[PDB]
Short mmCIF file of C-alpha atoms in Angstrom, two decimals:
data_model
loop_
_atom_site.label_atom_id
_atom_site.label_comp_id
_atom_site.label_asym_id
_atom_site.label_seq_id
_atom_site.Cartn_x
_atom_site.Cartn_y
_atom_site.Cartn_z
CA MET A 21 -20.88 26.78 -66.68
CA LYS A 22 -18.34 23.95 -66.67
CA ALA A 23 -16.81 22.60 -63.45
CA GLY A 24 -13.67 20.86 -62.23
CA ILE A 25 -13.49 18.35 -59.36
CA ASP A 26 -10.51 16.98 -57.41
CA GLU A 27 -9.36 15.77 -53.98
CA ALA A 28 -6.57 15.96 -51.42
CA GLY A 29 -5.57 13.38 -48.82
CA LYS A 30 -6.81 10.12 -50.32
CA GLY A 31 -3.53 8.33 -49.61
CA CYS A 32 -2.83 9.85 -46.19
CA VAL A 33 -2.98 7.86 -42.91
CA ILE A 34 -3.66 10.96 -40.79
CA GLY A 35 -6.25 13.69 -41.37
CA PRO A 36 -9.40 14.18 -43.48
CA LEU A 37 -10.21 13.48 -47.10
CA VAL A 38 -11.09 16.75 -48.85
CA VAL A 39 -13.09 16.93 -52.09
CA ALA A 40 -13.70 20.26 -53.86
CA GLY A 41 -15.42 21.60 -56.95
CA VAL A 42 -14.95 24.82 -58.93
CA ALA A 43 -17.24 26.41 -61.53
CA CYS A 44 -16.35 29.68 -63.31
CA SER A 45 -18.16 32.05 -65.65
CA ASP A 46 -14.87 33.34 -67.04
CA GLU A 47 -12.08 30.83 -67.63
CA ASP A 48 -9.57 33.29 -69.09
CA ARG A 49 -9.84 35.33 -65.91
CA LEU A 50 -9.14 32.14 -63.98
CA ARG A 51 -6.09 31.55 -66.17
CA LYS A 52 -4.79 35.04 -65.44
CA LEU A 53 -4.44 33.98 -61.79
CA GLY A 54 -1.94 31.39 -63.00
CA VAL A 55 -3.60 28.16 -61.84
CA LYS A 56 -1.87 26.22 -64.64
CA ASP A 57 1.56 26.52 -62.99
CA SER A 58 0.50 26.35 -59.33
CA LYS A 59 2.36 23.14 -58.43
CA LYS A 60 5.55 25.14 -57.82
CA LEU A 61 3.78 27.30 -55.23
CA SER A 62 4.50 27.08 -51.51
CA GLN A 63 1.85 26.42 -48.87
CA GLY A 64 1.70 30.17 -48.19
CA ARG A 65 1.28 31.14 -51.83
CA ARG A 66 -1.27 28.35 -52.37
CA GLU A 67 -3.47 29.73 -49.62
CA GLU A 68 -3.38 33.18 -51.23
CA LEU A 69 -4.32 31.79 -54.63
CA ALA A 70 -7.25 29.89 -53.12
CA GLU A 71 -8.72 33.14 -51.79
CA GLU A 72 -8.48 34.74 -55.24
CA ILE A 73 -10.18 31.70 -56.80
CA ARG A 74 -13.06 31.90 -54.30
CA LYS A 75 -13.71 35.53 -55.24
CA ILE A 76 -14.31 34.88 -58.97
CA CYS A 77 -15.64 31.30 -59.06
CA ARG A 78 -18.23 29.27 -57.20
CA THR A 79 -16.64 26.69 -54.91
CA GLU A 80 -18.02 23.74 -52.95
CA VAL A 81 -16.04 21.76 -50.37
CA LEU A 82 -16.66 18.45 -48.65
CA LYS A 83 -14.52 17.02 -45.83
CA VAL A 84 -14.62 13.49 -44.46
CA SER A 85 -13.05 12.98 -41.04
CA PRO A 86 -10.76 10.03 -40.18
CA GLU A 87 -13.50 8.66 -37.89
CA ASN A 88 -16.15 8.87 -40.61
CA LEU A 89 -13.75 7.41 -43.19
CA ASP A 90 -13.08 4.43 -40.92
CA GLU A 91 -16.82 3.93 -40.60
CA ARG A 92 -17.50 4.04 -44.34
CA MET A 93 -14.50 1.91 -45.34
CA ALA A 94 -16.03 -1.08 -43.63
CA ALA A 95 -18.38 -1.52 -46.58
CA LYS A 96 -16.62 0.48 -49.32
CA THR A 97 -13.09 1.09 -50.66
CA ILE A 98 -11.42 4.50 -50.62
CA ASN A 99 -11.97 4.97 -54.38
CA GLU A 100 -15.69 4.16 -54.15
CA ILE A 101 -15.92 6.65 -51.27
CA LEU A 102 -14.27 9.23 -53.51
CA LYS A 103 -16.75 8.46 -56.28
CA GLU A 104 -19.60 9.14 -53.87
CA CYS A 105 -18.01 12.44 -52.77
CA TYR A 106 -17.50 13.46 -56.40
CA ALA A 107 -21.19 12.87 -57.17
CA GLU A 108 -22.34 14.97 -54.20
CA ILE A 109 -20.19 17.93 -55.31
CA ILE A 110 -21.32 17.61 -58.94
CA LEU A 111 -24.95 17.58 -57.86
CA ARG A 112 -24.51 20.72 -55.75
CA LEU A 113 -22.97 22.58 -58.69
CA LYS A 114 -25.10 21.02 -61.46
CA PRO A 115 -22.70 22.10 -64.26
CA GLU A 116 -23.07 21.76 -68.02
CA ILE A 117 -20.19 19.30 -67.93
CA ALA A 118 -17.85 18.24 -65.11
CA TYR A 119 -14.17 17.34 -65.41
CA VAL A 120 -12.82 14.98 -62.73
CA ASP A 121 -9.37 13.59 -61.87
CA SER A 122 -9.20 9.76 -62.10
CA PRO A 123 -7.51 7.66 -59.32
CA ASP A 124 -7.31 4.52 -61.47
CA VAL A 125 -5.65 4.24 -64.88
CA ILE A 126 -8.96 3.54 -66.69
CA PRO A 127 -11.22 6.67 -66.67
CA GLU A 128 -14.20 5.43 -68.72
CA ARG A 129 -15.62 3.30 -65.92
CA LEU A 130 -15.57 6.26 -63.51
CA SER A 131 -17.22 8.54 -66.09
CA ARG A 132 -19.98 5.95 -66.60
CA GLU A 133 -20.79 5.40 -62.93
CA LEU A 134 -20.71 9.15 -62.29
CA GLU A 135 -22.95 10.08 -65.22
CA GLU A 136 -25.37 7.42 -63.98
CA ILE A 137 -25.44 8.64 -60.39
CA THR A 138 -25.72 12.31 -61.35
CA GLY A 139 -27.59 12.20 -64.64
CA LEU A 140 -25.17 14.86 -65.87
CA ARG A 141 -22.33 14.93 -68.40
CA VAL A 142 -19.03 13.93 -66.76
CA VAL A 143 -15.48 13.50 -68.09
CA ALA A 144 -12.94 11.82 -65.79
CA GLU A 145 -9.36 11.77 -67.04
CA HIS A 146 -5.63 11.11 -66.78
CA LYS A 147 -4.43 13.26 -63.86
CA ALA A 148 -6.74 16.02 -65.13
CA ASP A 149 -5.33 18.67 -62.77
CA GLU A 150 -2.71 19.43 -65.40
CA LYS A 151 -5.00 19.60 -68.44
CA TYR A 152 -7.99 21.67 -67.31
CA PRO A 153 -7.54 24.98 -65.44
CA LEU A 154 -10.83 24.21 -63.67
CA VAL A 155 -9.50 20.96 -62.18
CA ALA A 156 -6.18 22.55 -61.20
CA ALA A 157 -8.23 25.21 -59.38
CA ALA A 158 -10.19 22.45 -57.64
CA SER A 159 -6.89 20.88 -56.58
CA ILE A 160 -5.71 24.15 -55.03
CA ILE A 161 -8.92 24.57 -53.02
CA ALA A 162 -8.83 20.96 -51.74
CA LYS A 163 -5.11 21.12 -50.79
CA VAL A 164 -5.45 24.42 -48.88
CA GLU A 165 -8.44 23.16 -46.87
CA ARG A 166 -6.62 19.95 -46.02
CA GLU A 167 -3.47 21.87 -45.01
CA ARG A 168 -5.33 24.10 -42.56
CA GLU A 169 -6.70 21.06 -40.76
CA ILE A 170 -3.27 19.41 -40.68
CA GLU A 171 -1.81 22.55 -39.09
CA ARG A 172 -4.61 22.65 -36.52
CA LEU A 173 -3.82 18.99 -35.68
CA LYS A 174 -0.08 19.56 -35.28
CA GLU A 175 -0.94 22.43 -32.96
CA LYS A 176 -2.82 19.91 -30.81
CA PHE A 177 -0.84 16.65 -31.16
CA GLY A 178 2.67 17.83 -32.10
CA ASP A 179 4.59 17.54 -35.36
CA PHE A 180 3.71 14.14 -36.84
CA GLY A 181 5.28 14.96 -40.19
CA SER A 182 3.30 14.96 -43.44
CA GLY A 183 0.81 12.29 -42.44
CA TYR A 184 1.81 9.90 -45.22
CA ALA A 185 3.13 6.39 -44.55
CA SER A 186 6.25 7.30 -46.50
CA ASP A 187 7.36 10.16 -44.26
CA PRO A 188 9.83 8.61 -41.74
CA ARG A 189 8.66 11.06 -39.07
CA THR A 190 5.09 9.83 -39.58
CA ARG A 191 6.00 6.15 -39.18
CA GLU A 192 7.91 6.81 -35.98
CA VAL A 193 5.23 8.96 -34.40
CA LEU A 194 2.56 6.43 -35.42
CA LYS A 195 4.60 3.68 -33.81
CA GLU A 196 4.81 5.37 -30.42
CA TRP A 197 1.15 6.42 -30.43
CA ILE A 198 0.21 2.78 -31.07
CA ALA A 199 2.52 1.57 -28.29
CA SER A 200 0.95 4.07 -25.87
CA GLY A 201 -2.45 2.49 -26.35
CA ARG A 202 -3.84 6.02 -26.69
CA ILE A 203 -4.06 6.91 -30.38
CA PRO A 204 -5.20 10.39 -31.45
CA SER A 205 -8.57 10.67 -33.18
CA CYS A 206 -7.01 11.98 -36.39
CA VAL A 207 -5.51 8.58 -37.27
CA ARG A 208 -7.37 6.44 -39.84
CA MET A 209 -7.61 3.12 -37.96
CA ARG A 210 -8.88 1.07 -40.90
CA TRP A 211 -5.79 1.97 -42.89
CA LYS A 212 -3.58 -0.89 -44.07
CA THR A 213 -0.54 0.79 -42.52
CA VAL A 214 -2.14 0.97 -39.07
CA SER A 215 -3.32 -2.65 -39.07
CA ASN A 216 0.12 -3.93 -40.07
CA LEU A 217 1.69 -1.85 -37.29
CA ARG A 218 -0.81 -3.07 -34.69
CA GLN A 219 -0.16 -6.63 -35.80
CA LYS A 220 3.50 -5.83 -35.07
#
């Protein structure tokens, strides 16, 4: 079987990093589910599609908490962390060939390092989620898992917006949490955004 790998939450300041892999024995059946045009789907429809994917394909998920990300980012960058997560998923699935979505503009270097770590055939590409049904499926699984955690967090800490530095609601909420001296555990402390706000 072939497999697709992707992530959700790499650029967020709140919440986990989720990496997922999907391997199917029947791609045309996967296509029938309509993974190709899943970007238009709502959070509710995405969740439903993820359940259908899980029933006909093997899936593997990995989640890295904000706390654990902060720990690992002391010695590595977010992209290197991703690379490590990608390798773990590929090794669990051990596919014939694995298609991955590339964070940087130059894929070749990622393919090399991955094929070396895994010893398997790997093809990292240009925003591969919209080229290979397998990767798009991986994207759906990762996004749904991330979303469930985000919802759980809002239930506990209130509505902090999307969790991205761009969302105005997120910046505001982050500002007051910092000023309170009591910051929730779901905030990535080693993030550039947080440092700059604490230095303010």
